[PDB]
Write a protein that binds this ligand. Structure first.
Ligand SMILES: CCCCCCCCCCC[C@@H](O)CC(=O)O[C@@H]1[C@@H](N)[C@@H](OP(=O)(O)OP(=O)(O)OC[C@H]2O[C@@H](n3ccc(=O)[nH]c3=O)[C@H](O)[C@@H]2O)O[C@H](CO)[C@H]1O
Ligand SMILES: [Cl-]
Ligand SMILES: [Zn+2]
Ligand SMILES: [Zn+2]
Ligand SMILES: [Zn+2]
Ligand SMILES: [Zn+2]
Length: 266
């Protein structure tokens, strides 16, 4: 595939799910070999694992005293579309959550793709690797195409479910929204997070219920979302990725752990 940028500057704005503050994004075109980077208060923050500063409830980056929260969704959409050269200017402290999915970013960026004059240098998984953390596991192995499976095991009605993304099925995961359980709200608010959360940008699930009046988009919308998150975190390898991945109960922390182990090995 050829390296790609955007045809023109694209803008997005809205509340950050964790800060509860308004922020604005400006996606700038960039030349071949630039890579994906964020820009905030005069500092460039590359979208790479060396710049990850926090992973508990979002994937956050920082450099030289400047931090940006919740990069997982914009990075997943850029990865899915193979956008390789772009500057994401952030006026604020977090990426806007919008409806909690990648839909708005995906629809706008997909209509503005500009192919460039280089073949993409893919990050190619060369051998099998397994990373683990207290009941959670992620396996990666060689593959000519990006294939990502997430298997969840939930304490509520969702039970045990899995979903697999393969290239060409981007539309199956870009609408899946972020979610949380009603029993998690206390903790998230207590640690100074979830300030912008509402039923308009997060699915809220209970032991037997879906609080959002619209309900779920898909019966397995939560696992489709976890696949979407893993594809965003994999872009921290700094190039579009080719490999077959299987995550059992993974989250941003384990995804970043896998990315760092893959980067170290290769
Ligand atoms: C008007 C009133 C409205 C009320 C609404 C406002 C409430 C406050 C706003 C909340 C906003 C946040 O909700 C945003 C936020 O944090 O969104 C995160 C997102 N970033 C990503 O976070 P992360 O990847 O780090 O998540 P974990 O993997 O760690 O899972 C998390 C827990 O699920 C367990 N788990 C996991 C997998 C499994 O198979 N089984 C199982 O049990 C696991 O053990 C752990 O206890 O995905 C999470 C989902 O999974 C989202 O919640
Ligand atoms: Cl925390
Ligand atoms: Zn090619
Ligand atoms: Zn926490
Ligand atoms: Zn997240
Ligand atoms: Zn997410």
């Amino acid at each position: 595939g050829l390296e790609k940028t955007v045809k023109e500057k694209l803008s997005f704005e809205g509340v950050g799910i964790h800060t509860g503050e308004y922020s604005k994004l400006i996606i700038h075109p960039e030349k071949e070999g630039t890579g994906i980077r964020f820009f905030k208060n005069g500092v460039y923050i590359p979208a790479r694992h060396e710049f990850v500063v926090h992973t508990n409830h979002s994937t956050d980056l920082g450099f030289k005293g400047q931090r940006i929260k919740t990069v997982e969704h914009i990075l997943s959409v850029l990865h899915l579309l193979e956008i390789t050269n772009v500057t994401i200017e952030v006026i604020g402290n977090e990426i806007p959550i919008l409806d909690g999915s990648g839909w708005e970013f995906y629809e706008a960026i997909r209509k503005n793709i500009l192919n460039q004059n280089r073949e993409i240098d893919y990050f190619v998984v060369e051998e099998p690797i397994i990373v683990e953390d207290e009941g959670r596991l992620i396996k990666a192995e060689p593959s000519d195409t990006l294939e990502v499976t997430y298997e969840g095991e939930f304490k509520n009605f969702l039970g045990r479910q899995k979903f697999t993304f393969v290239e060409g099925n981007e539309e199956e995961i870009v609408l899946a929204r972020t979610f949380c359980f009603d029993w998690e709200i206390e903790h998230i608010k207590k640690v100074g997070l979830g300030k912008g959360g509402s039923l308009k940008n997060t699915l809220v699930l209970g032991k037997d219920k879906v609080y959002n009046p619209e309900g779920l988009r898909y019966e397995n919308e939560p696992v489709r979302h976890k696949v979407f998150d893993l594809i965003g975190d994999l872009y921290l390898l700094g190039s579009p990725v080719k490999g077959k991945f299987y995550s059992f109960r993974g989250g941003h922390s384990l995804n970043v752990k896998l990315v760092k182990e893959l980067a170290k090995k290769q």
